[PDB]
Amino acid sequence: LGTVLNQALRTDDSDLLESCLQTLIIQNTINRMDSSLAGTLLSKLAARMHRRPGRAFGLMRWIQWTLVAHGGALVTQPDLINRLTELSRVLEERSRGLSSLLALKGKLDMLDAQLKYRKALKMAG
């Protein structure tokens, strides 16, 4: 899908981006993609990130592999730290609730347990 991404990014497509981002080969495409288009990709993926906070599971692995392959491509064209600037601003957003998000987690993994347990009483009774 490498040329697909190249085309879609440089033409600034929307739905082509959606088609290739619905889905290894991912890594191969990020090996074979370009640099400047990858930074623009970074920009609109932080955009999708900011727009709907639903799934992280593919797209973080994506930008992982961007910084894998063409990480130093932003070192090569380092005027776009203003692209890199907002990602800091973007990824500091999703750290927000974590400052006490676990304080939820335990009392909820508490009521998990007896509800598993009184359930684990239930077929026994």
Binding site: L102, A103, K105, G106, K107, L108, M110
Partner: protein, 99 residues
Amino acid sequence: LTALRHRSALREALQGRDELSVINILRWAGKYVADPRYRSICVDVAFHLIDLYAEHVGGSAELATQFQQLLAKVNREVEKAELAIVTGGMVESLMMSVE
């Protein structure tokens, strides 16, 4: 080590190291990141190591393993840090039912 942090010198103590020395210090820090009696100092000196010797890892792969193996143990240390506080809530939260 905690004295060599008390006096701020841990930088200077670390900077004069070679490859084999770095490996030994690395394997040590990896060996003791687990025990929360001194995880503070372990992680600090590891920070200085990464800050001070991460340049030649492309030259020497053997430390890159230990670098990975450093990462590797820690990867399993956040899970222990979480799995505690997973049960961490549980033990505190029984305590509010007893009254």
